[PDB]
Amino acid sequence: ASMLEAKFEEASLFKRIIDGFKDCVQLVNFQCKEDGIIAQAVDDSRVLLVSLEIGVEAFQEYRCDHPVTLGMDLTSLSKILRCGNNTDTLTLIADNTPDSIILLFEDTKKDRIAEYSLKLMDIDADFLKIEELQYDSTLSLPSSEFSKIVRDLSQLSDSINIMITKETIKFVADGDIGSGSVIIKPFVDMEHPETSIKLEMDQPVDLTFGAKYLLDIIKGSSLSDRVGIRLSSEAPALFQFDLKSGFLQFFLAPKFN
Amino acid sequence: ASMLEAKFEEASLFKRIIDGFKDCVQLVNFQCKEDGIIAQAVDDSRVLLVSLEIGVEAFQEYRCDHPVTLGMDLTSLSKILRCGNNTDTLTLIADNTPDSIILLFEDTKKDRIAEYSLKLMDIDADFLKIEELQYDSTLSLPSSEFSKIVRDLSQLSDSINIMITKETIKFVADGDIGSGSVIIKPFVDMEHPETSIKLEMDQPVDLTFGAKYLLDIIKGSSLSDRVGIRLSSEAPALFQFDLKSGFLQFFLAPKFND
Amino acid sequence: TLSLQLPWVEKYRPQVLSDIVGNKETIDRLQQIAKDGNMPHMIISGMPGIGKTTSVHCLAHELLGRSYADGVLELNASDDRGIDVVRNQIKHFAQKKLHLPPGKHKIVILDEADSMTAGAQQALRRTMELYSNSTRFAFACNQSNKIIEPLQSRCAILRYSKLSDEDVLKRLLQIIKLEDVKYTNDGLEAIIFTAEGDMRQAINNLQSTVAGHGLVNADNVFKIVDSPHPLIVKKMLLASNLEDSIQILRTDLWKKGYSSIDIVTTSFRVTKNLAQVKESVRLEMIKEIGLTHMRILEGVGTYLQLASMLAKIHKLNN
Amino acid sequence: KRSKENLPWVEKYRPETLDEVYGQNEVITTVRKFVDEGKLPHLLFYGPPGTGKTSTIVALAREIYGKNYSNMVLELNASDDRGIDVVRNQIKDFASTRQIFSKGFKLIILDEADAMTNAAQNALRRVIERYTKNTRFCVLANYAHKLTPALLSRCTRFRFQPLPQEAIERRIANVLVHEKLKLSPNAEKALIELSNGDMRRVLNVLQSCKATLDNPDEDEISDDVIYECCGAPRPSDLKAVLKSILEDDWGTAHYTLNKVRSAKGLALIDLIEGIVKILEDYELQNEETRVHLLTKLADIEYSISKGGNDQIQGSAVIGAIKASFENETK
Amino acid sequence: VVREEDKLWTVKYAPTNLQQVCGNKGSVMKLKNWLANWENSKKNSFKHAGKDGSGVFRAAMLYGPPGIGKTTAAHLVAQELGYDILEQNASDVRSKTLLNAGVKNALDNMSVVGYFKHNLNGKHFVIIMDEVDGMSGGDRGGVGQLAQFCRKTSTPLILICNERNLPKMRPFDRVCLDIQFRRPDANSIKSRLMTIAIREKFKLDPNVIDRLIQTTRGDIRQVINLLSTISTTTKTINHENINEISKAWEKNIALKPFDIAHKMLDGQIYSDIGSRNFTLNDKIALYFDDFDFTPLMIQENYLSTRPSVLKPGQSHLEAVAEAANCISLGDIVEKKIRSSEQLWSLLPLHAVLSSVYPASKVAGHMAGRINFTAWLGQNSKSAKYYRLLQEIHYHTRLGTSTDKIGLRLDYLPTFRKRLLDPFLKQGADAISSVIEVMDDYYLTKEDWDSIMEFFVGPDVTTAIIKKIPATVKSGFTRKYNSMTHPVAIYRT
DNA sequence: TTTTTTCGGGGGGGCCCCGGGG
DNA sequence: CCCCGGGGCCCCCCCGGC
Numbered sequence A: 001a002s003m004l005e006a007k008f009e010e011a012s013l014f015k016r017i018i019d020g021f022k023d024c025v026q027l028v029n030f031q032c033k034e035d036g037i038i039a040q041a042v043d044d045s046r047v048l049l050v051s052l053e054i055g056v057e058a059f060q061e062y063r064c065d066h067p068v069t070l071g072m073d074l075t076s077l078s079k080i081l082r083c084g085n086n087t088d089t090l091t092l093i094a095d096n097t098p099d100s101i102i103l104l105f106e107d108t109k110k111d112r113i114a115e116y117s118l119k120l121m122d123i124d125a126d127f128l129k130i131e132e133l134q135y136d137s138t139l140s141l142p143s144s145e146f147s148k149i150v151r152d153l154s155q156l157s158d159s160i161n162i163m164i165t166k167e168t169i170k171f172v173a174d175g176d177i178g179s180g181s182v183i184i185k186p187f188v189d190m191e192h193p194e195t196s197i198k199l200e201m202d203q204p205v206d207l208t209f210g211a212k213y214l215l216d217i218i219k220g221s222s223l224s225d226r227v228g229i230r231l232s233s234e235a236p237a238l239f240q241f242d243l244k245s246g247f248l249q250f251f252l253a254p255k256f257n
Numbered sequence B: 001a002s003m004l005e006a007k008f009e010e011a012s013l014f015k016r017i018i019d020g021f022k023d024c025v026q027l028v029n030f031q032c033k034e035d036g037i038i039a040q041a042v043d044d045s046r047v048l049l050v051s052l053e054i055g056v057e058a059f060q061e062y063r064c065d066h067p068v069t070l071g072m073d074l075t076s077l078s079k080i081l082r083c084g085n086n087t088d089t090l091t092l093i094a095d096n097t098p099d100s101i102i103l104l105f106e107d108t109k110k111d112r113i114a115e116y117s118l119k120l121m122d123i124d125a126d127f128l129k130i131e132e133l134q135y136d137s138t139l140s141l142p143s144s145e146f147s148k149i150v151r152d153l154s155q156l157s158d159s160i161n162i163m164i165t166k167e168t169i170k171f172v173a174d175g176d177i178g179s180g181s182v183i184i185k186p187f188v189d190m191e192h193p194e195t196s197i198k199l200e201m202d203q204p205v206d207l208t209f210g211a212k213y214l215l216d217i218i219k220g221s222s223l224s225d226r227v228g229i230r231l232s233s234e235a236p237a238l239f240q241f242d243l244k245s246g247f248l249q250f251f252l253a254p255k256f257n258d
Numbered sequence C: 001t002l003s004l005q006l007p008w009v010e011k012y013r014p015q016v017l018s019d020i021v022g023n024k025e026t027i028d029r030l031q032q033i034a035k036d037g038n039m040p041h042m043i044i045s046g047m048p049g050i051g052k053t054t055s056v057h058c059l060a061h062e063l064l065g066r067s068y069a070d071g072v073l074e075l076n077a078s079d080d081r082g083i084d085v086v087r088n089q090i091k092h093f094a095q096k097k098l099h100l101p102p103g104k105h106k107i108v109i110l111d112e113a114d115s116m117t118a119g120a121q122q123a124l125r126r127t128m129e130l131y132s133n134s135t136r137f138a139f140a141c142n143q144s145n146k147i148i149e150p151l152q153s154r155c156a157i158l159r160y161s162k163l164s165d166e167d168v169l170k171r172l173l174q175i176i177k178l179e180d181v182k183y184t185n186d187g188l189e190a191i192i193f194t195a196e197g198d199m200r201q202a203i204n205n206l207q208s209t210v211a212g213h214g215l216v217n218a219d220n221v222f223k224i225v226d227s228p229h230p231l232i233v234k235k236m237l238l239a240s241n242l243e244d245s246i247q248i249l250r251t252d253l254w255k256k257g258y259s260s261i262d263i264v265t266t267s268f269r270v271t272k273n274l275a276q277v278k279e280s281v282r283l284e285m286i287k288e289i290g291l292t293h294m295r296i297l298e299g300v301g302t303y304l305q306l307a308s309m310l311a312k313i314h315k316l317n318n
Numbered sequence D: 001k002r003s004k005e006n007l008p009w010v011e012k013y014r015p016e017t018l019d020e021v022y023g024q025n026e027v028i029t030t031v032r033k034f035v036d037e038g039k040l041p042h043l044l045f046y047g048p049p050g051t052g053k054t055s056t057i058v059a060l061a062r063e064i065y066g067k068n069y070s071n072m073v074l075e076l077n078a079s080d081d082r083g084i085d086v087v088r089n090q091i092k093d094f095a096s097t098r099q100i101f102s103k104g105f106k107l108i109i110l111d112e113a114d115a116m117t118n119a120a121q122n123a124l125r126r127v128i129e130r131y132t133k134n135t136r137f138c139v140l141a142n143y144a145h146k147l148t149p150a151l152l153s154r155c156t157r158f159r160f161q162p163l164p165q166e167a168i169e170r171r172i173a174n175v176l177v178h179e180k181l182k183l184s185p186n187a188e189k190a191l192i193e194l195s196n197g198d199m200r201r202v203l204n205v206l207q208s209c210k211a212t213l214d215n216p217d218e219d220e221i222s223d224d225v226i227y228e229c230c231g232a233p234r235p236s237d238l239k240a241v242l243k244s245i246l247e248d249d250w251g252t253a254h255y256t257l258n259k260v261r262s263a264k265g266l267a268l269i270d271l272i273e274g275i276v277k278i279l280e281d282y283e284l285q286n287e288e289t290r291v292h293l294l295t296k297l298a299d300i301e302y303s304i305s306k307g308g309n310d311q312i313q314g315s316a317v318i319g320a321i322k323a324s325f326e327n328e329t330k
Numbered sequence E: 001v002v003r004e005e006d007k008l009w010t011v012k013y014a015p016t017n018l019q020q021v022c023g024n025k026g027s028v029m030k031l032k033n034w035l036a037n038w039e040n041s042k043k044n045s046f047k048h049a050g051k052d053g054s055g056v057f058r059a060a061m062l063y064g065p066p067g068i069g070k071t072t073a074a075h076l077v078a079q080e081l082g083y084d085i086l087e088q089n090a091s092d093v094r095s096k097t098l099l100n101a102g103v104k105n106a107l108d109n110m111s112v113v114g115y116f117k118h119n120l121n122g123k124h125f126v127i128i129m130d131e132v133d134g135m136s137g138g139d140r141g142g143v144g145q146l147a148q149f150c151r152k153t154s155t156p157l158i159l160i161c162n163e164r165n166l167p168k169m170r171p172f173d174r175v176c177l178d179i180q181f182r183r184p185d186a187n188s189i190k191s192r193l194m195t196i197a198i199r200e201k202f203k204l205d206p207n208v209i210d211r212l213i214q215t216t217r218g219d220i221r222q223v224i225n226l227l228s229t230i231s232t233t234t235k236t237i238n239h240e241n242i243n244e245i246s247k248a249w250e251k252n253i254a255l256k257p258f259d260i261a262h263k264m265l266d267g268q269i270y271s272d273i274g275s276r277n278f279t280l281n282d283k284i285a286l287y288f289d290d291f292d293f294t295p296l297m298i299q300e301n302y303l304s305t306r307p308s309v310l311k312p313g314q315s316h317l318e319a320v321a322e323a324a325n326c327i328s329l330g331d332i333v334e335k336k337i338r339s340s341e342q343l344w345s346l347l348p349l350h351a352v353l354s355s356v357y358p359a360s361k362v363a364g365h366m367a368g369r370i371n372f373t374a375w376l377g378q379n380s381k382s383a384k385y386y387r388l389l390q391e392i393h394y395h396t397r398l399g400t401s402t403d404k405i406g407l408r409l410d411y412l413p414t415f416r417k418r419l420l421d422p423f424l425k426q427g428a429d430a431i432s433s434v435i436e437v438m439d440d441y442y443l444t445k446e447d448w449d450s451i452m453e454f455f456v457g458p459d460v461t462t463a464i465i466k467k468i469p470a471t472v473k474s475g476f477t478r479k480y481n482s483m484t485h486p487v488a489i490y491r492t
Numbered sequence F: 001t002t003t004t005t006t007c008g009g010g011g012g013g014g015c016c017c018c019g020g021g022g
Numbered sequence G: 001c002c003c004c005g006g007g008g009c010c011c012c013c014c015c016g017g018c
C-alpha cells in the first residue's frame, strides 16, 4: 500500500463517474500518472469510444510514485462501489506490478473501516490518439433537455438525425410506427444562465446516429449539468460532460451517408 | 368463534411478523394457549430453525380455552393477510377440532367487514426444545447496519465469515471477483442509544455461514430496530429480533470447517 | 454413535502422481509435464474409479504449488456450468491477472465434462483459444464422445484403461500394511475379482469387510460383496439343458430378489457381449430378449415370461 | 389420525426399532455393527417390494439420532422434487453444514432413488465424494438398472431377500397376539404361499380375513376364509382342472373348467398361474413339452393382460396343455 | 511479456500471412476476390454478377471441417484489404434482442477506431460471425436475424460454420456465397510439419508425417498438438512406435449418415473374422452415432446391394423379405419408444431391429450410390395434401354426407367430371355451369386448383389443365372474380 | 449427398411488475 | 411522485443407450 494512493473526499464521485459509462464499455484500462487518471475504452461494436480524465484536483489526496495501469471490469468495480456510504472517504491503493487493487471506505464520525480487494484483469488494447479537430458546429445545452429529447425520439426509430443550421438544431427520428421532429432555437437567459442553449455555427451539418449509443451517452447527464456536442461534416461527434477537475467524452461514429 | 379469539389492534403487525420469516419456511405449526402463541419451523434444507413467540400483551383481546395447534402454509397465509387494510383490526378465530382458521378484518369507522377462511394442514411436528446455551460471545447492533453489511458482502461470495475478537467484530467475504472485510468496534453514544454497538466476549469465535440464509434472516429487521447475535463454537448462531411482547429467533448452523 | 470413520478411499487418496497405480505411460507423461511445465489443454477419459480426478488434481497441485488457491478453477457436475457461467465466470478467470512462475499457467478443471451442454462447450472454444497464453483447460469424463469435436481438436487426448489385477493387489497390500489388516490370499483374490478393475470399489469392499468381520477371507468377502449377477446371467444363457437354465433362473436370480426388468436388461447386455457365440445366433437371442423386455415393460413382469424367453433361446441354440 | 388403531395393518405394524425387522438378519447385524463402532459407509439397499428397506433405514436413523431423528436427517423420495437444482442447492447445503441440534454426522436418505434422473445422479457424485468426512448417503432401490455406475461405485450394497417363511410366521404370531385372532395351520400355510415373500400382502390379507369373520373373538381363520376373501382357487380345484385336462376328452375338460370356475367365480389368470406352478415340478421326458408349455402359456398370459375373450383363452389353455403333453409319448 | 517458450505451438506457428496458410488455395483466392470487389458490386447494387459469379452475394459463408484454418483465413483476408474487423463468436450473446441492438447498428455505421487510426476502406466494418453452428435456437436464436442481415447490409459480412448441412442453417440456403474448406492434402502440411520438427529439436521421419496426418483426419491443429505431446517425452518418432502413437491419438468421430449406411451395409464386418474385429457392440455404437437417421438410411438402401452373406439355398429376395419384416418390427418398437410412456430404454433393441439385423441379412457390395432417405419429403407432401383435403372437406361439409377419406375416394372423381371435363369439352361455354357447382359446395378457385391435384395414375390433370387455352382460364378467373359467392365458415 | 412424431426434464431468453430508492 | 434493480413467471428449444 505504498505505490499508488488516491483519496477521494467523497466516494459518491467515483461511483457516479463509473455509472456514467459502465453500460457502454465493460473492460477498461485506467492509467494513473503523476497528473491524474486517464481511461480509454471502446465498446463491443467498435463504434463508440469513451474517454475519461480525472485530474489531481479531483482528489482529497493523490500520490503516484510511478505510472501504473489497471485493467478493471466495470461490473465488479460498481458492485464494490455500491458497498460504500455517501459520507465516506474512498481510497484507491495499489502496489508495484499489482494483481489487485484495494478500495478503502473510511468514516470519521464512526470508527469503522471497510476494505475491499478487486482482482485486476489483463486487457490488451491499443491506445488511439485522439488529436484535436476543429469541428464545424459547437453546441452547449442542459443535460436534462438533451436526455429528454433522446429518450423521446428513441422509441420512434432506431436512428436519430441531427441537423444543425443557422440558429436552429433539428432532431428527427422518422421510423416505422411513425416519425418525430423536435426543433431547438438558441437562446440565452440571464436570470437562469444554467438553462441557455448556446450554438456556435460555421458550416451546416446533418449527421445520423444510432439511438442506442445516444441512450448510453445520456446516462452521463448526472455528472454535468450542461452537455457539449461538437459536430463535423463526417468526423465522429464528441459529447462532453465536464467534471470539477476533468471530463467524460464520448466519440460516436456517424452512420455512413 | 368460540375457542380461540385473538384480536390484533393493528392488522399490519401480524403481516410484518409473517413476512419476517415467510421466505425461510413454508409449513408452520402455530400453538395457541392461554399465555399466547408460539411457533417453530425448520427449513427444507434443515439448516435454519425459526422460532416465533407472541405474548398476550400484543393483542387488544385474547382468549384461548385449551391449547390448539394450527398447521398453515405461510404462502397462503401471506396471501390472505395481504388483503387487509392498515386501518382495520384483525381477529383470528378458531373452533374445536378446527379444519380452518378465520381471519376477520374490521373497519368500524367505515363499517367494513372482510372475513377469510384458510384451510389447515396436518403437520407431524413436535416442538423441539431450544435448550439454552451459554454462548461464548453475544453482541447487539442496529438491524439496518447488519442488513446493509450482509447485502454488501453477499455480492462477493456465497459464504460470510464472522470473527469475534476482543473489542472487534469482523465480517469477511471472499469470492471470484474479489474480497471484502467490514470491521466494527463496540461504540456507545448516550445522545442516541439506538446506533450503539454492544459486545460481550468470553472466548473469541470464528464461524462461516451461507450468504443466502443470512439474506433471508435480515428480512426480520422490519420488526425491531436492533438485532442480537449470539455466537459460540460448536453451537448454532442465534439471531434475535425483539417484539413488544415476544420475539423472533433464527438458529443458523455454521458450515463445516473442512 | 455419532462418530464417523474416514473412508480409506479418502484417507489414502494419492497426493502425488507417483502414488497412482496403473496407466504407467500416461502417469509418466503427466509427471514429465509437471516437472517441465507448459501444460496443454487435455481431456482424460476412462471408466469409473481408475484415477482420473486424482491424476488431474495431483497434476494441478504439483504444477501450481502455493498458488493452487488462486490459479485453479474447479467445476464439476455438482456446480452450475451453464452458458452464463462459461461466458462470465470462466472468462473472467481466464482474463484474471496473476503472476506465476516462469512456465506455469492457470488451470480450469472441468470434472465430469461429459455432462456439459452443447452450448457451453461451444462457448468454451474462443475462451480457450484467446487466453491460452495464461490459462489451460483440463477435462475429465467417462465418455469422450460427449465432448464436441471442436473442443477435442484443441485438447490432448489421454485415455485411461482398466487397472490390472497386479496394480489393484499392490495398492490393496499397501493399504493393508498401513492399516494393519488381517487377511488371506483367497480374500484378496475375491476382492479383486469382484472389483472388476475399479479401485474405489475394491477399497470400499475391503474396508467394509474389515469393519463387518475383521478377517479378510473369501467367506467374509462374499458375505459382504455379492456374486456379480451378470456372471449368473451368462451362466444361465450358456446352459446346455433348458432345465439347468430354468433352475438357475429360479434359484440364483428369482428367489434372490432380483427384478424381472433387471434380469432382462442384464441378459440383453450379456448376449450383446457374448463373443463366444456366432453373431447371427446372438441377434436372434437379442430379438427374443427384446420381445420379453417389451412384455415386461407393459407390466407382465412374471417368472413365466422369463421362463418362456429361456425356452425360446434354448430352441434357437438347438 | 385419532389413534394407532385407525390405521391399516401395513402402517400400524411398521417396525420402530431394528429388533422388529425380521427376515434380514445378515443385513441388520452388519448395519448394527457398523453403527456401533462408528464405521457407517455410504449404503445402498436393493430389494423387492415390501421387504423392509424403508423400515430398516428409518430404524437405523432412530438408532443413531434417537426420537428426534426427523429433524436431523434429510429424507427425499419420489413424491418430492429431486431435480438437478435440488441436488445443487438443498442436498449440498445440508451436506456441507453442521447439525443444528447435535454435533454428530449427517444422514441423507434418497428413498426410491431409481426414480431420479440421470443428471441428478451424476450431480450427486461429487457431493458424495466431497463431504464424506461429515455426511453419509443411503440409497434405496427396487431396480438397479436405473442407477448409474458412478453412483454404484461409491456405495456399499446390501440385498434384501424375499422374506423367508420363518420371519413371516413369527410376525404373523405377533399380529395374532396383538389382534386376538386364531389362525389354523393350513390357513397360515396358504397365507405364506400367496404372500410370495411380501409382508404387506400378508398383513392386508390378514386384515381382510379378520373383517370377514362374523365373530372375530372366537371364530378362527381357516383356509376357506383365506381363499374366499382373496377369491383365489383352492389346490383341489387346480388339481381337478389339471387332471381333467390331462386325462379326459375335450368336452369333459371344457365342462370341468367351466364348472370349477363358475362355482366360486375364479379368474383364469389364477388358474393358469397355479397350473404353471404345479407343472413346474413334473418330470418330463421330452424338453419340447416344457418349451411348448412355457411359450404358449406365456402368450396366453400376455393376451389376458390386455383383455380379450375369456372362453377362447380358456380353450386355448386346454388345447396348449394337451398339445404340449402329446409329445411325451414319443 | 509472455515468454515464447510458454506458448502453444498452434499459437507460435500461426499463419501470419495469407500465403502461409496451407491448403484450400482456391477457396482463399475466391474469398479474396469476392471481398476485393465488394465495393464494385455495391456501386452496381449487387446486380451485375462478375466473371466468377460472386457479384450477387453481399455476404460470404465459409464452411468446412474443424481445424482447417477458416478463422485464420477470414481474419487475414480481412486485414490484407485494410478493412476493420468486428468479430463475434459463441462466447458472446447473439440472440434476437442482442443482435438487433449491437450488430444491427454496425451494418451501416462508420468505425470510430477506423477514423482515429487513419487506405480508403479502413473506416468500414467487415463483420465476422464465427461459430454460427453454435448459435443454438430457432427464431429467437438470432440465426434468422443473421440470415435477414445477409440480405440487407452496407458492409461486407463473413459467416464461418462447420456443418452447413444442418437444419438450423436452412435460413441461409441462398443468402451468401458459399466457400468450401476441405481436408488439406498431406503434401501441403508436410513442409510446415518438417519446419516445426526442425525448430523443436526432435526426430521426425518424413514418412511418418503421412500417417500422422491420416490419424488426425486433416486437422492441422490436432497434428501440432500430437507432435507437442509426443515430443514432450519421446523425441524419437521412429517406425517402432507409429502404431502406438496412432492408436493413442485416434479421435473418436461420429460418422455421418452416408458413411453410417455404407459401413453398416458392408459384408466384410458380418464375416467371422470381420465380426471378431468389428463386434456387435461396434455396430450398435455406429447406430447410436445418429439414431434419428440411421434406420431411415438402412430402410432406403437395403434393396440396392449385391449381398455377400447369403445362406446356401437362400436367394436375394428372401433375404430382402426378412430384412423388411425386421424393419417393420423395428418400426413398431419405435412407435413404442416415442409414446406417452417414453420407453427410451428400448433404444438399443431398436438399433438391432431397425438397422443391424436387416443390414446383416443383405450386407455386401453397394450396387450404386448411397441415397438419402426419401421418407421425409414424402411425409411432408402427405401432410400438405391432407391439410388441403381437410380444408376442401370442411368447405363442402354442408352439402355432402361423408368423411374426408370418403370425400377423397368417392366424391372427387365425380366432382372432376363436373369441374374439369366440361371445360375440356364445351370450352368457354362451360364457365357458368362450373361456377354453379362451385357455388353449391362453397368451393373457391383455390379449392378448384387443389382438387385438380389429388388425382393419380391415368387421371392426372397436370398436362390436361396445361393444355387448356389461356382464354378459357382467363374467362373463368374473370367470371369468378366478377360475382359474389357464398361462404360456409364465416368466422367472426 | 439431404432432412418426422411425444412427456418430462433441463436450460436459456424474454419480458412483467413489485419493491425500494431518490 | 417517478425511475431503476431484481426476484418471479412465461415461452421456446433440445435430449433421451452403454
Ligand SMILES: Nc1ncnc2c1ncn2[C@@H]1O[C@H](COP(=O)(O)OP(=O)(O)OP(O)(O)=S)[C@@H](O)[C@H]1O
Residues within 6 Å of the ligand: C008, C009, C010, C012, C013, C014, C019, C020, C021, C022, C046, C047, C048, C049, C050, C051, C052, C053, C054, C055, C141, C142, C171, C199, C200, C203, D125, D150, D153
Ligand atoms: N490409480 C489409483 N491409484 C490409487 N487409488 C486410486 C486409483 N484410482 C482410484 N483410486 C482410489 O479411488 C478413489 C477414487 O478415485 P477417482 O480418481 O475419484 O476415480 P474416477 O476416475 O474419478 O471415478 P469417476 O469417473 O469420477 S466415477 C481415490 O481417492 C483413490 O483413493
Ligand SMILES: Nc1ncnc2c1ncn2[C@@H]1O[C@H](COP(=O)(O)OP(=O)(O)OP(O)(O)=S)[C@@H](O)[C@H]1O
Residues within 6 Å of the ligand: D009, D010, D011, D013, D014, D015, D020, D021, D022, D023, D024, D047, D048, D049, D050, D051, D052, D053, D054, D055, D056, D141, D142, D171, D199, D200, D203
Ligand atoms: N422385515 C419386515 N419386518 C416386518 N414388517 C415388514 C418387513 N418388511 C416389510 N414389512 C411390513 O410392510 C410394511 C412396509 O415395509 P417397507 O419397509 O416399506 O418395505 P419396502 O421394501 O421399503 O417397500 P418399497 O421398496 O417402497 S415397494 C412395514 O410397515 C411393515 O409393516
Ligand SMILES: Nc1ncnc2c1ncn2[C@@H]1O[C@H](COP(=O)(O)OP(=O)(O)OP(O)(O)=S)[C@@H](O)[C@H]1O
Residues within 6 Å of the ligand: C150, C153, E009, E010, E011, E013, E014, E015, E020, E021, E022, E023, E065, E066, E067, E068, E069, E070, E071, E072, E073, E161, E162, E184, E192, E220, E221
Ligand atoms: N491451413 C493451416 N495452415 C497452418 N496452420 C493451420 C492451418 N489450419 C489450422 N492451423 C493451425 O491450427 C490453428 C488453428 O487454426 P484455425 O484457423 O482456428 O482453424 P479452424 O478451421 O477455424 O478451427 P475451428 O473450425 O474454429 S474448430 C492455427 O493457429 C494454426 O496453428
Ligand SMILES: [Mg+2]
Residues within 6 Å of the ligand: C052, C053, C054
Ligand atoms: Mg472422479
Ligand SMILES: [Mg+2]
Residues within 6 Å of the ligand: D053, D054, D055, D111
Ligand atoms: Mg420403501
Ligand SMILES: [Mg+2]
Residues within 6 Å of the ligand: E070, E071, E130, E131, E160
Ligand atoms: Mg473457426
